[PDB]
Design a protein around this ligand. Structure first.
Ligand SMILES: Nc1ncc(-c2ccc(S(N)(=O)=O)cc2)cc1-c1cc(F)c(O)c(F)c1
Length: 308
């Protein structure tokens, strides 16, 4: 890999020093700015090899993760925070005989899969959804969809673990380049992509991801976080079976969702959400404010995330 203490030059002038390799479509290191540098509050993602998939993810961060754009959006929407990892820059570095691409990103805490089976308090499941909706509205406005929401790609902040961040934009897609929404085409060859437990129906058919697909995956997530299981989990080996089960579930809403819930818990809000989500056309803009009203109907403001 790359040795500790290596100095990297971003394309905005800045210099960064590598830290410990904290695991790994690219390698992840802790990062320190040389200027006004204690504990690492930055992270570096470095390309695995020549001509890799970093480009996709790199493009997204450069295009939409800039702090300027975010701070402006937060003011316009009156939001407390927006769960996108801050992007500090990217550049080129030479290891051995060739150049490599690296990203510099805000440091984050632990992911949700590690925290909790995977069952959280209902209050928490709903808040996670509401937070994810804000992130989705913003990225969707910027012509991009995530495509892989799951517990593993939601991370708490390092400095503030009260706040949560959607991570891992590798499988992200530009659905609306330059205001031109993609056409609908089913492709069996480019089919069943993403995490099978939560991938959208459009993904099962090889249709290019559009905004609704993100909303659908979130609904699946929230159901799994609340119930601890999904109907299709028994037969993940057959992706087609999974598509069938997802179709069935949505075809028979809301009882299908309601029946799934374990005694003593309710999936009422989640069932409505999937109802609202499954109503959408391929090119339709989700009603983010209605979806958020669904997950927090009373209108009491959100409290701190609870992982007790
Ligand atoms: N921004 C981040 N901050 C912290 C970690 C991290 C924390 C703890 C641990 S660990 N094993 O618990 O020590 C490992 C990694 C990872 C990312 C991150 C890496 C990527 F490659 C992404 O694409 C991405 F969106 C996010």
């Amino acid at each position: 890999p790359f040795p500790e203490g290596k100095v990297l030059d971003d394309m905005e002038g800045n210099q960064w020093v590598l830290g410990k390799k904290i695991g790994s479509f690219g390698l992840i290191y802790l990062a320190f700015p040389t200027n006004k540098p204690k504990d690492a509050r930055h992270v570096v993602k470095v390309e695995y090899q020549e001509n890799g998939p970093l480009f996709s993810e790199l493009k997204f961060y450069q295009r939409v993760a800039k702090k300027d754009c975010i701070k402006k959006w937060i003011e316009r929407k009156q939001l407390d925070y927006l769960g996108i990892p801050l992007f500090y820059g990217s550049g080129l570095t030479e290891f051995k005989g060739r150049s490599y691409r690296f990203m510099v990103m805000e440091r984050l805490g632990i992911d949700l899969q590690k925290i909790s089976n995977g069952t959280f308090k209902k209050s928490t499941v709903l808040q996670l959804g509401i937070r994810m909706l804000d992130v989705l509205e913003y990225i969707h406005e910027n012509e991009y969809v995530h495509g892989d929401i799951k517990a593993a790609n939601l991370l708490l902040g390092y400095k503030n673990p009260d706040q949560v961040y959607l991570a891992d934009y590798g499988l992200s897609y530009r659905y609306c380049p330059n205001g031109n929404h993609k056409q609908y085409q089913e492709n069996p060859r480019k089919g069943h992509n993403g995490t099978i437990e939560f991938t959208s129906l459009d993904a099962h058919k090889g249709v290019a991801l559009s905004r609704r697909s993100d909303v659908e995956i979130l609904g699946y997530c929230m159901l799994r976080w609340l119930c601890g299981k999904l109907p299709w989990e028994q037969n993940l080996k057959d992706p087609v079976a999974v598509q069938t089960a997802k179709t069935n579930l949505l075809d028979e809403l809301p009882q299908s969702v309601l029946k799934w819930a374990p005694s003593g818990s309710s999936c009422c809000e989640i069932a409505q959400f999937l109802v609202c989500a499954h109503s959408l056309a391929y090119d339709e803009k989700p009603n983010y404010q209605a979806l958020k009203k669904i997950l927090n109907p009373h209108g009491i403001p959100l409290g701190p995330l609870d992982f007790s």
